[PDB]
Ligand binder design. Structure first.
Ligand SMILES: *[C@@H]1O[C@H](CO)[C@@H](O[C@@H]2O[C@H](CO)[C@@H](O[C@@H]3O[C@H](CO[C@H]4O[C@H](CO)[C@@H](O)[C@H](O)[C@@H]4O)[C@@H](O)[C@H](O[C@H]4O[C@H](CO)[C@@H](O)[C@H](O)[C@@H]4O)[C@@H]3O)[C@H](O)[C@H]2NC(C)=O)[C@H](O)[C@H]1NC(C)=O
Ligand SMILES: *[C@@H]1O[C@H](CO)[C@@H](O[C@@H]2O[C@H](CO)[C@@H](O[C@@H]3O[C@H](CO[C@H]4O[C@H](CO)[C@@H](O)[C@H](O)[C@@H]4O)[C@@H](O)[C@H](O[C@H]4O[C@H](CO)[C@@H](O)[C@H](O)[C@@H]4O)[C@@H]3O)[C@H](O)[C@H]2NC(C)=O)[C@H](O)[C@H]1NC(C)=O
Ligand SMILES: *[C@@H]1O[C@H](CO)[C@@H](O[C@@H]2O[C@H](CO)[C@@H](O[C@@H]3O[C@H](CO[C@H]4O[C@H](CO)[C@@H](O)[C@H](O)[C@@H]4O)[C@@H](O)[C@H](O[C@H]4O[C@H](CO)[C@@H](O)[C@H](O)[C@@H]4O)[C@@H]3O)[C@H](O)[C@H]2NC(C)=O)[C@H](O)[C@H]1NC(C)=O
Ligand SMILES: *[C@@H]1O[C@H](CO)[C@@H](O[C@@H]2O[C@H](CO)[C@@H](O[C@@H]3O[C@H](CO[C@H]4O[C@H](CO)[C@@H](O)[C@H](O)[C@@H]4O)[C@@H](O)[C@H](O[C@H]4O[C@H](CO)[C@@H](O)[C@H](O)[C@@H]4O)[C@@H]3O)[C@H](O)[C@H]2NC(C)=O)[C@H](O)[C@H]1NC(C)=O
Ligand SMILES: CCCCCCCC(=O)OC[C@H](COP(=O)(O)O[C@@H]1[C@H](O)[C@H](O)[C@@H](OP(=O)(O)O)[C@H](OP(=O)(O)O)[C@H]1O)OC(=O)CCCCCCC
Ligand SMILES: CCCCCCCC(=O)OC[C@H](COP(=O)(O)O[C@@H]1[C@H](O)[C@H](O)[C@@H](OP(=O)(O)O)[C@H](OP(=O)(O)O)[C@H]1O)OC(=O)CCCCCCC
Ligand SMILES: *[C@@H]1O[C@H](CO)[C@@H](O[C@@H]2O[C@H](CO)[C@@H](O)[C@H](O)[C@H]2NC(C)=O)[C@H](O)[C@H]1NC(C)=O
Lengths: 330, 343, 330, 343, 330
């Protein structure tokens, strides 16, 4: 055990953590792979998502090569403070942390040739600007940008270790509201005022689950809309009954819209849910407005003809609206 | 104290806390047990639960053998950080807390033989994936998995201090659950393979069953009473159109209010739970009660009701007479089928 | 200050923080007293309360005895990190911190004989399990459990310094929702697998104030119930007036319960507030259902008897229900 | 810069930051003044307020005299933590933040005489107990007390740098209040005795007056306009029973909705405030209006209204004729008595 | 690497982080440039906005001059804790932090002539007092104030490094609710009782997007107000129908107003949204009063004239009210 202890002491004796490997030489190549433990929250209100992952980085540091020990030295995570590590950060993250119970979830594993394995368990909230025009029939694309903060491409280069197999665990992920249609790994360079920087991107394509919205949002609106047509089958002279049905369904539609509208942030552009809810709101609005013409055209001055046609036009026009809507968004 | 102090300073002499005991020589065996001081609240919206535990870890380090008057030493919080301890973490943990009031909530003991008992007080938030198809009459097994983050099974193996059933102990006053009952737990262990190698994983599942009384008084009873109230319209005379229209339409608005609120407590899942079907059927009944009067009113001939002293009058609808039996009976049958299926 | 500087440096020279006073000898006796500054919050939803206090601990350390200075040496609070302090913790605390503006709210005061006064200003959110069956007419018993994390009674013993005068400031506590009825100090030795641990418990008995609930919960429910009786004074033939009155009161009653559904917690069993709301809901339900019986007997298959008798039985039975409810819960 | 560097090293030569200036020799006199950059929001629910201050403390430490080309030195944040500073704290503070972005927001200036100016930028949440019986027409004096945590008045005494009135300064753009007006401030000092000894306390009271325009447009006007609406029922004909029953009952529901929400903003206090009495009276007026019609309907004979051409017809209720005057007048009187009392 | 390692150790040996460059001499000029990443949030309730940026400081320190290396040393971020850096803070900043995953998001770059470039990735929540009188048609001016904490203009000077190009990334800002109309750079000296302090200010002007409030707030209020005019076309003797319509529109209007009360702040004065809702509330209130006058003038004492006259004046006056409203705010 002391032989190993002496070896580790030698490596860190005179070790300069302020200098990257091969300082002034060819850029150090850093390979990364990720194991995704879970995706926890995907919030439209905050336009972000939470991600718990195992984040591994591989690079070769000749200063950390050792011989005579036919084993890979897994060391206490507190040794990471005594080594050079890439200044990797997540360009689009909002808030992130490394877990610290019972100790900091950090791993340092050395290999004889000088390869360093640096693993972290990270929960990161990352910004995902979502396009909600087709919501809730929408498909999103959320990314995770991995870039070096200080070092340019002359000093550090990134690559996915293992190609398209560099990210695992995606198939096992279960989201209460989305399905992972696909994921991609990209590698590129980004040019700033201070120089070019290496970039690694991980992106997912998310398709939203529509079944939930049918029971919560679409179904109550559909039934109230059908209810508003009950007015067309009541006698023209039942003013109290037809107004009470008409005005209470208009109230009901507002009730439906209000306690649903708090599920979405203040996003001012037209969405798929808005068009359907407003389509049904216009219909109930017209059903109550239709009786104004019916009542006036009898008492103020044929009457059954207008109601008779409404018994067909309103069901027909609503089906035409539904056909156009679903085809356009599906 | 001086004699004792010298022993402590000698213990860590030449001691490297970056190397596990028996490095390159054998496997470090860690014996663990848990004492749950309070099984905290469970969150359906976040699919997580809280748990307060005394996480006890035990292992052997020959480098820490000592001789003296006492056979057991209670180390300070500072000593525990000067020596090597397992890097145990929770696989499904979300955001855990190590309590630091007033001092670090840790304890490290050493026996003369070099056996280390190491305890800490933690509040752990953990992932509990829930299949809520039978909600609110659902049961779940919330797991709690832990192991070494960095050391593979060839280096560090975990074990339970005593029999696995007797290794996870819950305090008698530990249940901090408002909506669940802690039926019990099962204790197991296995192996997990990852990109960095194979690791020993110690697992514990807490079996929970949801209390239904909240949803009966909040959701089921108002929904049942609303359905009953919709059928009370069948006993009103057919000529009171404004009254039976207001009766039916306002019962529909009550179901809409109840149906929306019930879902908002649920996490945003996209399948029908047990409560969804009950609300959907109740919605259909209240919807069908207003459609039924739409049919009755379509066959009413006279706008005036029976005057009480008999000019002809409308007869009592045969649709109403049958609905006074069919609707209560179908709803009664639906409740036996629903409650027997899920209970 | 030259002589004082020598004395202070002398005490800490060779000082071993890792060892308790009289280590390996008789247990060190730690006296405690608390000066409560405020009880900020008591939340039924989270099942916890927030307590700010001044937490003093007294023990004798012969390693810190000094002579020649006829003064009690108050030292900069940062010296506490250089001394041995008890490993005290609150067994049922959820979230707590020491205040740190402008500096750490901590005090060390040495005495010639070696007595150490160690005081902290702590704000702790402590878990308090509550039995809310009699809510809002409930009395709660919240506690604070003080224990040594590591040592046993062979090493450290706790006691209340000053007996029942140890805790002060209780009489000056004002809570918008509760009133402090009593407080008790308990000393006991909790037993675990590891061994016996010293324990001190400070507990308060809280009796909830009812003024807020009268105006917010009981009064609106009572008035709606009395309003439902107005139907008994309207003609049986006025079906539109009596049904609208009856069903709107049912709607109003659910509005109260649903709006108080979100403020109240998710505690799934029958509480006192539930019984009163349920009782009132039954009375308004029966008043509406009473007219259904009146309508059916007249139009379907005397009539004035049911209404005349309802004008007395309903006010009387509600009074009888109230008498039983208030006597049982008060 | 070498000459300057040497002086710094010599200063802390043998300096003991654990001992206050003049320990065992005299009483340390700390001179304090506060500059309020922003008087943050006030939370009635939590009964606290936020205040952003530049907290300046000044005292003399003869151990830090120096000689050099300059007569005043500005010390970096690292130097301030290396010397002794007062252990000042806020007695009624709940959770305070000493900003640390990008660097520590502290400042230590030393004059050759040995005088130290020590400023820090703080955000302080403080307890402000409120007597809300006059709410929303209530005024409060939120306090801000501070002193030494560990040093008794025999060791450390605090004084204001200049005239107490001029020692606390509020920046012109410093008002960060939404619903309050900072009328002014009174600055005092005194002695508070506790279990550990007598301590000096510096106190500042900020006199706040609540802006009422919010509750006038959110609560008072809807309540007043609903009460007026309930009285519009008096002008309908007594034969329109469904209309006047719907009219009266929905105004009761509107009062219930207004009463429930108005108290949600308020902290859960068990006494009656100025808004509760106004709402209770509005509730009684709306309740009485529906009871008024119940009495009118009891004395209605004919179920048909006046035909418009001329068989007898009901006469306009004498209860209605009087209620059209008494109800507006009594509410008008109540408003004058109510507003003149609290305004 | 050894040559550079000894070069760096030469610089720090004898370095005094406690002294600013040219201490006691001319003030040290610090240039600043900001690269804005995003404005995550802008909250009216808290009156602040969240800003993510790369904050760069640029100055010259002769003590860090190095010769023989014709390269700009990019060092590990941990070297920043061993150098002098400005005591820059954000005056109106409520809470802020430097991102810390995987490492601290900090950059140090040295140059041969002793010039230091110092970059930080900062997320800050900055206070922004807002004038919401024209809300939601309001235009806000939210600033960031940059100042030195404990240095005066006799010691440190600030300037925007690059003129009007010192701030970039404004076109990257994607606020769903706002659009960045303009930004400015201001350099000024702030004089306190302690002296004069250099000040730099970056300010943005935000114009709120109105489309959401048209669909969510204005359009429902317009349709409810129109619905209240359906009463004018119903018979004067349909008391139950016309009262139910009028009173339910009042209840509907309150529902819009009351639920809007929870999302909007406690700002106690009249705003643009209040004037439209109060205008629409008065119109529906008067429509309900219109029938009361019709009902009274018939049974209590023409009738058809008032309905005819109301069918024109109400739509016309509401159109005029809208014309005056939108001209005065758009
Ligand atoms: C979510 O949305 C993001 C965009 O915001 C998508 O990301 C884009 O993904 C595409 C691939 O689907 C990327 O396009 C690819 O870029 C590769 C890298 O380009 C860099 O390196 C090359 C040299 O290798 C340089 O020439 C170039 O300037 C860059 O520096 C290319 O190698 C790829 O080439 C492929 O296509 C070409 C033809 O176009 C072939 O000739 C090649 O052989 C090869 O097949 C390709 O162009 C794109 O760069 C990404 N954009 C960003 C901003 O990262 C995500 O894909 C999307 N998520 C999902 C799930 O759809
Ligand atoms: C909130 O609820 C808690 C319980 O959940 C209450 O706490 C209990 O309080 C009672 C007193 O009111 C406690 O009873 C007392 O316990 C003391 C300690 O017992 C320990 O030590 C003895 C040996 O000395 C052991 O046998 C025992 O097992 C414990 O280890 C006793 O010393 C007390 O006895 C004294 O009084 C009795 C009369 O009451 C005399 O007969 C005795 O001679 C002696 O003078 C007494 O038994 C009880 O232990 C507490 N329980 C817990 C769990 O702490 C709170 O009181 C309540 N809050 C309020 C405000 O009421
Ligand atoms: C402005 O103020 C903020 C706090 O409000 C400071 O942030 C703190 O910075 C210090 C110094 O870097 C941190 O202390 C260090 O913590 C390391 C561990 O941190 C991890 O674990 C803790 C929990 O234990 C987490 O909270 C944290 O996020 C990390 O996950 C230690 O390893 C460090 O010790 C090492 O360095 C010291 C240096 O003296 C050596 O003595 C040690 O031997 C060892 O090598 C160190 O203790 C502190 O954790 C930070 N707090 C927070 C909340 O993040 C800013 O630094 C400060 N800014 C300036 C300019 O001063
Ligand atoms: C949001 O609102 C803030 C105010 O709260 C606006 O900030 C103001 O912006 C104006 C410019 O639009 C600033 O006015 C300019 O100030 C400069 C700095 O003044 C200091 O330094 C000069 C010496 O250089 C001193 O004399 C002076 O006392 C200050 O110490 C001036 O240099 C500018 O002068 C220019 O215009 C004048 C004519 O007005 C010419 O005579 C000059 O030659 C020169 O061209 C000018 O006065 C103002 O200071 C800012 N105020 C604050 C508090 O920062 C934001 O612009 C606004 N946001 C948006 C987007 O509009
Ligand atoms: C969702 C249900 C939809 C049902 C749709 C049902 C559609 C349908 O068929 O309606 C016609 C009839 C209406 O019954 P109802 O009794 O209401 O109507 C009577 C019927 O029209 C008689 O023919 C009339 O006598 P007459 O000969 O004209 O002198 C009588 O006049 P009056 O003497 O009273 O003035 C009417 O009142 O109903 C059924 O036959 C089904 C009963 C069982 C229905 C069971 C339903 C479960
Ligand atoms: C809170 C109210 C409590 C009221 C308690 C009960 C108060 C009480 O006694 O009411 C009944 C009485 C009359 O009520 P009102 O005028 O509405 O009823 C008329 C009355 O019954 C006449 O006697 C009838 O004529 P007739 O002679 O039969 O031919 C007439 O019928 P018709 O001619 O139209 O066909 C009825 O309409 O009202 C008062 O004295 C009001 C006093 C001031 C009340 C001031 C209240 C503020
Ligand atoms: C140091 O503290 C002790 C304890 O508080 C002081 O002893 C007290 O002296 C007063 C003198 O009137 C007595 O009334 C108390 O009963 C003593 N307390 C105890 C616990 O014995 C002592 O005086 C303090 N030293 C100085 C110099 O003030």
């Amino acid at each position: 055990m002391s032989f190993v202890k002496e070896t580790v002491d030698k490596l860190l004796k005179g070790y300069d953590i302020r200098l990257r490997p091969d300082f002034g030489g060819p850029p150090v190549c850093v390979g990364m792979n990720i194991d995704i433990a879970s995706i926890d929250m995907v919030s439209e209100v905050n336009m972000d998502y939470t991600l718990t992952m195992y984040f591994q980085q591989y690079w070769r540091d000749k200063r950390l090569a050792y011989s005579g020990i036919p084993l890979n030295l897994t060391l206490d995570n507190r040794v990471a403070d005594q080594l050079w590590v890439p200044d990797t950060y997540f360009l689009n993250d909002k808030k992130s942390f490394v877990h610290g119970v019972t100790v900091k979830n950090r791993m340092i594993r050395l290999h004889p040739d000088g390869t360093v394995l640096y693993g972290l368990r990270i929960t990161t909230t990352a910004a995902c600007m979502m396009d909600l025009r087709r919501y809730p029939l929408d498909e999103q694309n959320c990314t995770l940008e991995i870039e070096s903060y200080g070092y340019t491409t002359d000093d550090i280069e990134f690559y996915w270790r293992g190609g398209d197999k560099a990210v695992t665990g995606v198939e096992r992920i279960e989201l209460p509201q989305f399905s992972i249609v696909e994921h991609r790994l990209v590698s590129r360079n980004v040019v700033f005022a201070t120089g070019a920087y290496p970039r690694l991107s991980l992106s997912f394509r998310l398709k939203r689950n529509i079944g939930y919205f049918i029971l919560q949002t679409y179904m109550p609106s559909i039934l109230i809309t059908i209810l508003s047509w009950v007015s067309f089958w009541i006698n023209y002279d039942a003013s109290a009954a037809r107004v009470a049905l008409g005005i209470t369904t208009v109230l009901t539609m507002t009730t439906i819209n209000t306690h649903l509208r708090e599920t979405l942030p203040k996003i001012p552009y037209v969405k798929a849910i808005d068009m359907y809810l407003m389509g049904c709101f216009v219909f109930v609005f017209l059903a109550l407005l239709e009786y104004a013409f019916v009542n006036y055209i009898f008492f103020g001055r044929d009457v059954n003809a207008i109601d008779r046609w409404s018994r067909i036009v309103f069901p027909f026009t609503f089906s035409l609206f539904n056909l156009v809507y679903w085809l356009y968004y599906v | 104290t001086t004699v004792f102090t010298r022993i402590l300073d000698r213990l860590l002499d030449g001691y490297d806390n970056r190397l596990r005991p028996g490095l390159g020589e054998r496997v470090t065996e860690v014996k663990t047990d848990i004492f749950v001081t309070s099984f905290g609240p469970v969150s359906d919206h976040d699919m997580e639960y809280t748990i307060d535990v005394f996480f006890r870890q035990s292992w052997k380090d020959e480098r820490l053998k000592f001789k003296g008057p006492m056979t057991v030493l209670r180390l300070n919080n500072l000593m525990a950080s000067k020596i090597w301890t397992p890097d145990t973490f929770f696989h499904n943990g979300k955001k855990s807390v190590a309590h630091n009031m007033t001092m670090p909530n840790k304890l490290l003991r050493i026996t003369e033989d070099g056996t280390l008992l190491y305890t800490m007080r933690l509040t752990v938030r953990a992932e509990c994936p829930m299949h809520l198809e039978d909600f609110p009459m659902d049961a779940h097994a919330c797991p709690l998995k832990f192991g070494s983050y960095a050391y593979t099974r060839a280096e560090v193996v975990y074990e339970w201090t005593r029999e696995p059933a007797r290794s996870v102990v819950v305090a008698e006053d530990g249940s901090r659950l408002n909506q669940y009952d802690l039926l019990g737990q099962t204790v197991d262990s296995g192996i997990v393979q990852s990109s960095t190698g194979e690791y020993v994983v110690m697992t514990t599942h807490f079996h929970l069953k949801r209390k239904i009384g909240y949803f009966v008084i909040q959701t089921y009873l108002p929904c049942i009473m609303t359905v009953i109230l919709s059928q009370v319209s069948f006993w009103l005379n057919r000529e009171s159109v404004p009254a039976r229209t207001v009766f039916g339409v306002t019962t529909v608005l009550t179901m809409t209010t109840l149906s929306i609120s019930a879902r908002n407590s649920l996490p945003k899942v996209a399948y029908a739970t047990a409560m969804d079907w009950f609300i959907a059927v109740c919605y259909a009944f209240v919807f069908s009660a207003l459609i039924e009067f739409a049919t009755v009113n379509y066959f009413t001939k006279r706008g005036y009701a029976w005057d009480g002293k008999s000019k002809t009058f409308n007869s009592v609808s045969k649709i109403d007479r049958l609905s006074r039996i069919a609707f209560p009976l179908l709803f009664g049958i639906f409740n036996l089928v629903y409650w027997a299926t899920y209970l």
